[PDB]
Every structure is written in C-alpha cells, then in structure tokens.
Curated annotation (Swiss-Prot), chain A:
Record organism: Saccharomyces cerevisiae (strain ATCC 204508 / S288c)
InterPro entries, per the entry: KOW, Rib_uL2_dom2, Ribosomal_eS4, Ribosomal_eS4_C, Ribosomal_eS4_central_region, Ribosomal_eS4_central_sf, Ribosomal_eS4_KOW, Ribosomal_eS4_N
Alphabetical keyword list: Cytoplasm, Isopeptide bond, Phosphoprotein, Ribonucleoprotein, Ribosomal protein, RNA-binding, rRNA-binding, Ubl conjugation
Classification of source organism: Eukaryota, Fungi, Dikarya, Ascomycota, Saccharomycotina
Record-listed Phosphoserine modification sites: S31, S246
Main location: cytoplasm
Subunit note: Component of the small ribosomal subunit (SSU). Mature yeast ribosomes consist of a small (40S) and a large (60S) subunit. The 40S small subunit contains 1 molecule of ribosomal RNA (18S rRNA) and 33 different proteins (encoded by 57 genes). The large 60S subunit contains 3 rRNA molecules (25S, 5.8S and 5S rRNA) and 46 different proteins (encoded by 81 genes).
Modified residues (Phosphothreonine): T114
Subcellular location(s) per record: Cytoplasm
BP-aspect Gene Ontology terms: cytoplasmic translation; translation
Descriptive protein name: Small ribosomal subunit protein eS4A
Pfam families (UniProt xref): 40S_S4_C, KOW, Ribosomal_S4e, RS4NT, S4
UniProtKB/Swiss-Prot annotation, chain B:
Keywords: Cytoplasm, Isopeptide bond, Nucleus, Phosphoprotein, Ribonucleoprotein, Ribosomal protein, Ribosome biogenesis, RNA-binding, rRNA processing, rRNA-binding, Ubl conjugation
Name this polypeptide is given: Small ribosomal subunit protein uS4A
The organism of origin for this protein: Saccharomyces cerevisiae (strain ATCC 204508 / S288c)
Classification via SUPFAM superfamilies: Alpha-L RNA-binding motif
Record-annotated disulphide pairs: none
Swiss-Prot record, chain C:
Similarity field: Belongs to the eukaryotic ribosomal protein eS8 family.
Any one GO molecular-function label of the UniProt entry: structural constituent of ribosome
Annotated PANTHER family: 40S RIBOSOMAL PROTEIN S8
The protein's name in its UniProt record: Small ribosomal subunit protein eS8A
Summary of the function given for this chain in its UniProt record: Component of the ribosome, a large ribonucleoprotein complex responsible for the synthesis of proteins in the cell. The small ribosomal subunit (SSU) binds messenger RNAs (mRNAs) and translates the encoded message by selecting cognate aminoacyl-transfer RNA (tRNA) molecules. The large subunit (LSU) contains the ribosomal catalytic site termed the peptidyl transferase center (PTC), which catalyzes the formation of peptide bonds, thereby polymerizing the amino acids delivered by tRNAs into a polypeptide chain.
Subcellular location: Cytoplasm
Top-level taxon: Eukaryota
Source organism of this protein record: Saccharomyces cerevisiae (strain ATCC 204508 / S288c)
Pfam family, one: Ribosomal_S8e
GO terms of biological process kind: maturation of SSU-rRNA from tricistronic rRNA transcript (SSU-rRNA, 5.8S rRNA, LSU-rRNA); translation
NCBIfam families xrefs: eS8
Keywords recorded for this protein, A-Z: Cytoplasm, Phosphoprotein, Ribonucleoprotein, Ribosomal protein
KW Ligase (keyword) present: no
Curated annotation (Swiss-Prot), chain D:
Subcellular location: Nucleus, Nucleolus
Basic and acidic residues bias: start-end ranges: 6-24
Protein name: Probable ATP-dependent RNA helicase DHR1
Family designation: Belongs to the DEAD box helicase family. DEAH subfamily.
Amino acid sequence: ARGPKKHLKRLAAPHHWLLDKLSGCYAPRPSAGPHKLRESLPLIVFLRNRLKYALNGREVKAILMQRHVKVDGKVRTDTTYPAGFMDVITLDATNENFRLVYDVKGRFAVHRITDEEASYKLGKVKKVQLGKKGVPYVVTHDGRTIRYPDPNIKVNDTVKIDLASGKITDFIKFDAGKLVYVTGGRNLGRIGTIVHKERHDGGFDLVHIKDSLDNTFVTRLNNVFVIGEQGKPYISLPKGKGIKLSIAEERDRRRAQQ
Amino acid sequence: PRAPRTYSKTYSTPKRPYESSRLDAELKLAGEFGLKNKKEIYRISFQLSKIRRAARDLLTRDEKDPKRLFEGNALIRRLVRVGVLSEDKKKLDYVLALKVEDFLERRLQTQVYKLGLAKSVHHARVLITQRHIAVGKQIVNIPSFMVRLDSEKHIDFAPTSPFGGARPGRVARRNAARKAE
Amino acid sequence: GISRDSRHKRSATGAKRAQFRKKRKFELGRQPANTKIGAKRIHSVRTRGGNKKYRALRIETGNFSWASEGISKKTRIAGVVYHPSNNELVRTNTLTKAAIVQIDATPFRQWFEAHYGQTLSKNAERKWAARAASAKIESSVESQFSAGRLYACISSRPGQSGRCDGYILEGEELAFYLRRL
Amino acid sequence: GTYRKRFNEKARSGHMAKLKELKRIRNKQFTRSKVSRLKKKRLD
RNA sequence: UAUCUGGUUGAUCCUGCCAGUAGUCAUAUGCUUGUCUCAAAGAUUAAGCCAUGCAUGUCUAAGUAUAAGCAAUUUAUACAGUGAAACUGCGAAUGGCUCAUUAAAUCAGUUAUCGUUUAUUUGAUAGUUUACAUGGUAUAACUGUGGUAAUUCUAGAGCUAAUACAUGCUUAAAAUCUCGACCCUUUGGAAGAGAUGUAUUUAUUAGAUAAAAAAUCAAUGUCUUCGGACUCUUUGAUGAUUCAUAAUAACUUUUCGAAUCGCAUGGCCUUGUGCUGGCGAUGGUUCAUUCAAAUUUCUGCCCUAUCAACUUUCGAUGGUAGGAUAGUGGCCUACCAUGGUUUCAACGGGUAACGGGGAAUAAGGGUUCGAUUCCGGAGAGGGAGCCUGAGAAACGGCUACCACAUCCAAGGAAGGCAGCAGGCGCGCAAAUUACCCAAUCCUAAUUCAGGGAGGUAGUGACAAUAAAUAACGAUACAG
RNA sequence: CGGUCUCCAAUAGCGUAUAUUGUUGCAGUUAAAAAGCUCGUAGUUGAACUUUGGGCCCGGUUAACGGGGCCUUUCCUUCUGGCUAACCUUGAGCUCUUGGCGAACCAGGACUUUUACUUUGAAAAAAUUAGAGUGUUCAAAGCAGGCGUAUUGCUCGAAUAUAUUAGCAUGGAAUAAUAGAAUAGGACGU
RNA sequence: GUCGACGUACUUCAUAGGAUCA
Ligand SMILES: [Mg+2]
Ligand SMILES: [Mg+2]
Ligand SMILES: [Mg+2]
Ligand SMILES: [Mg+2]
Ligand SMILES: [Mg+2]
Ligand SMILES: [Mg+2]
Ligand SMILES: [Mg+2]
Ligand SMILES: [Mg+2]
Ligand SMILES: [Mg+2]
Ligand SMILES: [Mg+2]
Ligand SMILES: [Mg+2]
Ligand SMILES: [Mg+2]
Ligand SMILES: [Mg+2]
Ligand SMILES: [Mg+2]
Ligand SMILES: [Mg+2]
Ligand SMILES: [Mg+2]
Ligand SMILES: [Mg+2]
Ligand SMILES: [Mg+2]
Ligand SMILES: [Mg+2]
Ligand SMILES: [Mg+2]
Ligand SMILES: [Mg+2]
Ligand SMILES: [Mg+2]
Ligand SMILES: [Mg+2]
Ligand SMILES: [Mg+2]
Ligand SMILES: [Mg+2]
Ligand SMILES: [Mg+2]
Ligand SMILES: [Mg+2]
C-alpha cells in the first residue's frame, strides 16, 4: 500500500465483536483514538449489535448526532470511535450507564453501573516521565496524560481517575496479593490475585495469578490490570466475577437454570 | 467480496456398489420404506457411518476423559431424542449397534404410515408431499423429516387439509357443482 | 537518481541480487551541497514529513565556541586549511563537518581583554582582580591570537542545518592537527 | 522464468535489456533453426 | 489391486496364469434439464490489443457571494434565507483487479528502534513578542476584446474577497545573572541600564550515591552567649545510555506564541454604543497516545554437482572522516587494510515459482494442489525520472524514450480496462454495454452529496440441500 | 409382391475421451543392481566407569500407583536490606506481655561450563477442520433464538479442541556430548 | 539418402500343472 488503510473486512475484524459473516462485506474500522484497534469496541457495534437500540448504521448516526451518547463524560459523534476497556458510556435519555469490561468468554459485556460508579474510571499507568519545564506526568492505558502525579505512582500501578476533572483521586500499587483483571491472551476476562511476579531482564515479565477457585495461571505482565485488593475491587464486577468454568460445569448450570 | 457460505455433501457412493447382496439389501429397504432412489439409502448410510465413527473414536479414549464424557453424553442425548436409541441403552457400545433401519423408521413417511393415517408407505409419501400432514401446528411436506419422540404424538391431518376439517379439495367441489348444475 | 537501497548491492556471499521492486521515494537521496565560503546563500529543502532542511550553498560567518573559557562568538571564516576525508575539499575551500578552518580572532581578543583586563572604574578593576587567577591560557592559542587567525574545527553539518558552527582547537587536538598541517 | 520466451518481445524491449545486463553479470564467471544449422554443416 | 465374469482340453474337479471389471478429482465434450434453498464465474505460461459508457468527489449555524440567480421583505441601508460559478480546506496514496518479475528475495512465527517519520483521532500544553485590528507587495469567479480545424487549450484589458498570500501589536509579580554612574577605601556598598517564553545549530555543566570519622591551603556565606559554632540541606526512569529534564555562552534569509467563524445577550456600575462575560467551530508549538510507515534479530523454501569454487578493475568484507537520508548502514565519496561465502553445497542454471492461512488423498508415515472470498508482497504495455502532499517513485498524476495506436484543414493535438459492463486475438462461438445506494462500510466542509466498493435481478445443470411426475378401489382378459 | 420386442443400472441427472522410492518399509549367489583391489578427506558412527542403597515424616488418588520433605560424610558462597518464626526470659491469664537473640522466607548486588533431549505454560489472526446448543416446515446452512402477553415485558447463547519447526518461560537430570587441577599459572582463609 | 549410433514411444514370442473319467 501507499498509505494508511481505511477499510476493514468482516473476516479480518476482531473476533470478540461477534459480527455476522454474511451480513455484509465490510466491518466498522475503529477510528484512531484512545484504544488500539483490536482492543476496542466501536460505538456502532455497542449501540446496534449489543444494545439493539439501533437497527442499522444510519440509526446509529442519528442517535449520535443528537448528542445522546457520552464516552467518559464527553459527548462523541463518531460512529467508529474506539471505545474500550474501562470506558464509561452514558445515555442520559435512557438514564443508563455502562462500563466496558470483558466477560469470562473474552468479549465486551453489557455491564450496567450506578451513577456514582459512573463518575470515575481506572487506568493502568503505562508511563511516568518528566515533561517540558520539569513537570512530571503519567500516561495511562487510554492515552490520558495527567500532570503532577503522586511521586509514589510508578509503572503498572492503577490510578482511579475522576471523569469530571480527569484528576487522580487514588492509586493502587502493583504487589503480590493484589486483585487483578486479565486483559489479553487466552485468559482474557479472568479475575484473580497476584502470587508472584517473575522478572526477566531484557524480556517479558510473567505474573502468576490465583483465582477464587484456587486455579493458577501464568500471564504476561502486559495483560494484567490491577483493580483492587482481594475481595474489595474498586469497580462493580460482571456476572460470574471472572471465574472460568469448564464446559461440563457450564452445561450443568445451564440445565439447572433451564 | 462477501464471506463464503459453507456447503457439504450429505451422501457418498459406497465402496463396491455392485455387490449382489448389497443390491438385494437396497431393494428390500426401498420397497419396505418406499424410498425414491438409492441416494436416500446412501444418505442414511453416510449419516450412520459418521455417527459410528465418532462413537468408535470416543471409545478409543480412556474412560473418564472429559472429552469422552462430554461428547459421548451429547451424542447419546441426540440419538435418544431422535428416537433411534432407546432410553435403557444409553452407552457408546449400543451406539455402535445401530442400523440404517432404525433411522429409516423415524422418517415422517414411515411414522405417518404406522400411525394409521395412511394405507401404505407410498400413500403416506403422497399425503406428505401434498401438504396433508402437520406435526403440531406446522405443515411438513418433507418425507425425510425425522420425527422426535415428543413430536411423535402430535402428527395429525393439517387444519388446512380437506381431511383435517377444511373445505373439500378442488375435485370435490367441482363435482358437487357439476352435479348441482 | 540517488538511492540508498541495499538491494542493488551484492549479498554478503557475493550473489548478484535481482530487482525486487521499483525504486521507492522513502529511500531517496539528494545531490550534495558543496558549501563554499562567500556571501550567504541558503535555500530550503522540503524533506519527509513537513520538516525542512536548510542548504548552505554559501556561508561566510559562523558561531564558534571557545570551550575552555566557556564562550562563543560569531566570527568570519577565513578558509579551510585541512580536511581529514579528502584534500580536494581543502583545495576548493569546501565547508563540511570536521573541516579545519581559520577564523577571525578579533571578537575573542576583545572579549578576553574585557573579561580579564589583559592582552594576548573600580568595578572593572575588582572584577579583573577576581578573575586574575584564570588569566593564563595555552601558548599555542595566544600565538594564533597574535597572528590574527585562530584554528577551529566545524562541528555542524552545513548541508543539513545550514549553519557553520564549530569550536576552536585546543590541547591535544590542536597539537595533533598542527602536526598534520 | 527469468529468460523465458515472451509473446511479444518487441513490445517490452527495455525489459529484455535488463535481462541481458543481468546475464552479463551473472554469467561473467564463464565468459572470462535446425535447417539453418544443418545447411551450414553441409556447406562446410 | 480386491470382488465378479470369461479363456486356458476329449470332458469334470483342484491349483496357477491370462483378459476385462475400482476410485474421486481435473480438462474437453455429448444428451436431458420441471420445483425450493444456495452459490461461483481465470487460464493460448496472450501481465496480448481495446471502440463506447461509467468507475472520485465533497458545505455545516459555524472560511470567501452586491451571480446584473431564486424567493421572501421592510428583520433587518454593511451582510443576514437558499444558492450556480470560482477561491480556500480535505480526499483522490483507500477501495477494485492481476500474479509478470522475485529462490534467504517475498512470506510464516518471533524480535528491535537506546536507529527514524507520522496527516488524523484522544489527553495535556504557550501572562515573557494601527490593535475599537495592517497591506496588494492580488488574483479567481465575473465584465469585455480575441486566436486556433481541433482538446478538461487559453491570450490582453478592467473589477473585487479570505481560516488564501504577506505583515504586525496588545497582559502579573518575583527571582536570578551581567554591565555598572557615584560615594568609599570598607568585610565595601551601589542609583540605574539591560537580558529571560518557545523553535533551530553548536559548545560546556548537572542528571549523586557500599557503608564511617579528621587536619590544613585558598575563596567565602549564615550565626550567637564575640567565643567559636554551623543541623533537617536536592536529584526521576531503564537490564543498560551522552536518557527524560534542567542550567550557562551565543547563533538563525528561522519558526510558534489566534488580525478567524457560528449561536445567545448574562453581571457590574461613576449611564458611557463604558467595563466584564457563556456554549461551540476551526487553526497552532511541543510531548504522549492511536492509525501507520521504514529498517531490523533468529529459524524455515522445489529440481540441478555432467554447476566447485564465487565476490574483489566498475564496493566485494571491514576501519576512519565526510556527504546524503526521517534516520542506522559501503547507501555514496576520499584514504586505508585484504578481506567475505563454500562439499553442513556457495556461485551459476531451471521453474507451467507471488508466500501463507488452506484443499485433496491416506490406516499411519507421506505425495500433490493453493491465479481464486482473509493476510502480506509486487504491477498498472516495457525501461527511466519526478511535482504535490503526512503519506506516491502514483500512472482513472506529469515528462522523455521503446512498441502500438486515434483525430487532423498536415500546422498540431490526444492515449493507456491486470476497474464494472462489452469487443478483438479464428473461419468454429458462452454472463447484462441491466437497476440501486435500501443493507455493509468508506470519502467530504459533512446526519443530507458521492461510491460499477458493494448490493439487487438477469444469464450455459460450476460446486451443494430438499424433492414432484401419482394414491385408493371395482371391472375386464390371460396362465 | 402390391401399396403411403423384452430386460438391466443410475435418475433431474447420465455417457464418452485424456489424465490420474521402502525413515516406518524394498532388493543385490543362481534373472534388475556389490565398484578389480587397497589407502584416504569431508559425512555418518564409535567400549566401560564418577550418588548407589538404606532409615523415617507429610499429604494425595484408586493394599497398588504416583508427589513432596528430612537423616545417612551429601545443605551453593558472600554482602546488604525487609519482615520475623522459634529459643531464652519478666509480668498477666496453651494465650497475651517485658527485654535480648534473631533461624527460615522474601528483595537486590557480587559469584556463575556450556548444549542436545523431554514435561508444562504462553504464542501460533479470522475464515476453514473437528465439535456443544438451536424444529432454518426437513436439510445444506445461519448464529441465531427462547418464555410470558389484558397491560407494561423478561431471558439463555454466540462454547471447546487442533496446529509442525524456530523464538520465550518452566520441572526433570536417565541417554549423548562439552570444560576443568600436570612445568600447578590449582582450591580455600578471621 | 528406404544411412549409423543414441534417446523416446510402442508391438510381439515364450503358461500351463496334478487327479479322475473315455
Ligand atoms: Mg525492552
Ligand atoms: Mg392448500
Ligand atoms: Mg447441450
Ligand atoms: Mg414432465
Ligand atoms: Mg410453487
Ligand atoms: Mg444575500
Ligand atoms: Mg484546491
Ligand atoms: Mg535462480
Ligand atoms: Mg532471512
Ligand atoms: Mg481529516
Ligand atoms: Mg489536538
Ligand atoms: Mg487581469
Ligand atoms: Mg559514518
Ligand atoms: Mg570508495
Ligand atoms: Mg506454486
Ligand atoms: Mg511466474
Ligand atoms: Mg495463492
Ligand atoms: Mg505501485
Ligand atoms: Mg494489456
Ligand atoms: Mg509509474
Ligand atoms: Mg484504467
Ligand atoms: Mg489506482
Ligand atoms: Mg472488464
Ligand atoms: Mg468549516
Ligand atoms: Mg573421517
Ligand atoms: Mg558410550
Ligand atoms: Mg515450540
């Protein structure tokens, strides 16, 4: 190619979107934004294929141009805006608030939250550095640059950000025993507690996580997201609380409830 | 371009079509069940071969294997639901004991014949293809329709059919009008 | 015409590679800007991205820094005296980085006289007395100062930034280049 | 594939030129019709 | 091969043998072709040539309308609704198509940028430099006069705008550092005059630390109980940096720091068209992020040894310096050494060689196929070179050459279907020059316009699913 | 001379033509193929030996099977830091509490033979393959859907496995290599 | 030139043996 691409084939789209393979030939390409293309849920998919409020892309555009949708407290009018992990989506007309958190299966879930919980979000500190004029700042996983951070905040920590002011209200250090959420790999969507961080210089650090059922799994440090102390997450968790269940157990539960 | 839509062959030619014993077996099957051609018999044989190969492969797995348990239970549940496998024979060994006749008996043609709605398998086929047979509230015109155990008790003449309480067909009212005139 | 591709070269084993593709813009080159002493002529060059490169086609003054005294002054460039890469740049008076040049010594002499009150109000005398301990300098620099032309080395790239900045030679570097001269 | 016969060599003369150059570089180590041939042989 | 059939003599058995019978897939072709669902369309290694039409344009309240445009009007004597043309901005570098070249090249998995560019999105970020607001150093559309056979050809003259072009001010305090009038010879002091944000270039400095105590030389600052005393004294990240950041001295055909636009009319009063003030749009420096790009580490390709030595004169391997690039690098230049690959197959040759995910067969090992729905690469008849732009060595952009080829008044002008339809390539053959942006998504100034991308329908049984052409009786005749 | 038939095969499908090597695991006297003989480089291959056995404890599966600890001449070394067990002791009732001592464990710096092999975990896009659920009227398929309903509505899914080699992390220490102390230029030290 | 050698593609000749019976 001679420049950036602008089209996305349906078969090439992220699997977790759960798009019909025969509905069309193209899928919404997420516009540039806070979250990476493959880790993001464009607003069209959320409003149409998840909430079912809109029956087609044109109706999604009609909804957005009415300014009814806010992402992290700010109105967005782009159909393919890349909403992503820990993003608060507010619909005032419906009096509804959502937080985009993976379910255990590895797909963004329709998780409703309260207004108080919609006032803040969490962000993994991806970088900490001095800017111009010697003003320290932290860069989080959604591209937010926050100046004058608490000096104790280091990389891999999780900062609680207030959406109204975009200021750090609280922070959580990365340490053993902390409650974490897996945001990548085949263990995506699971919740557990750190046991041990294996450090390899010049390579990828691995973290061993123990879930509530005592199962243990190893994941790269890039996919880990601290969300609180054990049993006391800073956010309301989805149904199932991030616990993986074997196919037989899922069958048993499904038959029991049916 | 749009994504491909999957397709598959529901039958296969047997290894030696010309075996005299095989020819006689196909003749008996077609005559007993009123099958149109050898394609239907090949289709049922292909399904049965697939089922039995799956069962054999599961049996090769060690007992208590999660894959064996899950897949074998699903397969036995399906076979019991369609009626091929009896309730008391819920094991993979009895899945290998199935025969084409078991599947053929479940066809809506044979069931319509057996329930007393038709005087022969061919009369049952004609009744089905002419939209006289309803499984529940749904008219079914496919002789190869495989009747489930629950569906077995709901086969009846369709509400729209002349035999099911609707008005007489075209011939009946035609002759009645000509007699009246 | 000029390209920085590695494909056109032979492989490490000595194989003659074939042409994989046509020449690409992102691996281009441009004609050298043989900067020369004279009335300033500089023309911009539009590079990859929106960035701009300045081409010193001619330049006759430069910001030269006296490192020992920690100063820098704008001075005229007398001429190129020695170049390590090739001698023809010396012959043609071509300014490029690492070229040994001669610069007018007047501003440095004036600054040193003002600062130390020496040669090569109460406040002025006080300040000169305070700085009297540092008055002494290397003999080699002072001989040049008597001559009127100081040896300097260009540390800028005139064909890229458009500047002819540099620094006066001192110590071991000056001794080495005087030996080479 | 490099020096295979083309349908219309005249229409791509420049291409042919490149090939020749390549040969001259590749085979530099070595250099350092039926009726027509038979006619020459019989004439000799 | 197996199974089955037949022959092996005067006949019948038992061996053996012989001949025919197996297979899906592929190509070509013949006969037949009623219904429902569904779906594809290559091939002369000819990436051979193309008549005709279409396939890329785009305007919101929010850049520029005295169209001598439309309609509304005294909501509007600066304009005010809608709005052709043109300027301005963006896109046209995506999509679609084909597989020619390409044998450590592409590509697959896996690495790196502490080796670089990045329009756009997202978050931060700029009190340091006539203003109740500057010019033509200026033109388009337009008016009017014209040339040419001809083209998306254009010449002279007259007008007039901007988020075009070019200029250029306005806003707190403090601190620090220089140069220092003068008084005074002190342990000296000091009016004042300057400088400071950012961007570029160069030079120098800081960016600490495995843990504890003293004596003096020089400069020299806070303090008391005038004797000596003097504590908490500032420093981030990486596995690692000359890193982030900061400081000093200057340098610059040298940048940026809002002369822009929409809606609304709130608060103070000393009652002035005075002061102040809301929600948005568009620009703008730098950093980070996102979309990307470039280069890159390790391992992995079919046949060939009757291809054994190859590379090095004209860069081959490496060093120093420079040039060039966004940047590393023999990428190129100058000077140097003589290196680098190879029987563990280099180099050369062949390829009906784009690579992979995948397809078929098979009990398993294997063998073959993959132009072809997704990913990546390369090309737009063949070589070569460029303008613009964040991004192109672009071809539905430009210039030359080679081959073809259209118009011509013979002076000149215009070309690229391996895009969608449709033709030629034979004298022998095969989808419609169809409808639409309603869905999918993409482009724009943008909900609205555009989209042969894509969908819809039509059209040789491509490949697949289901499935009609009769069912129930009586009579008659015959073995 | 005049004069103007039966059966078999498939079935909305059927016919015709061309085409369609042994690693596991081949053979070499007499019917393919052992070179006239020897030497010899690359390549492939290459004798045995170095911690074996014994005595206890803990917790798992279905008396067998496997997994950990100690002891047995068998513990990596060193420094620093963090926490602190147990041990001594005072006092108040095995539990708190005074004051010493601070093992184990954890973090970091130095110190360090290298691989082959195999186990486990990440990675290996989607589509495709296998495969769970689902009366598309059946099916090929698709990822749908399902349950109440006068009224306003509730709700389950879009599973799971496979993927060679190379790279990364990890447990093993059998088999096969590799290095070490011989002119001691060797190890250790309060 | 109904030429030689080689390469390639084909054609062809070598199948009956034992037991019983006449
Ligand atoms: Mg790293
Ligand atoms: Mg009817
Ligand atoms: Mg025909
Ligand atoms: Mg018919
Ligand atoms: Mg019909
Ligand atoms: Mg108007
Ligand atoms: Mg323009
Ligand atoms: Mg080759
Ligand atoms: Mg390679
Ligand atoms: Mg844009
Ligand atoms: Mg911005
Ligand atoms: Mg004019
Ligand atoms: Mg260099
Ligand atoms: Mg050279
Ligand atoms: Mg191939
Ligand atoms: Mg090819
Ligand atoms: Mg392919
Ligand atoms: Mg190209
Ligand atoms: Mg062509
Ligand atoms: Mg081109
Ligand atoms: Mg074209
Ligand atoms: Mg194009
Ligand atoms: Mg076409
Ligand atoms: Mg605008
Ligand atoms: Mg040897
Ligand atoms: Mg051995
Ligand atoms: Mg592996």
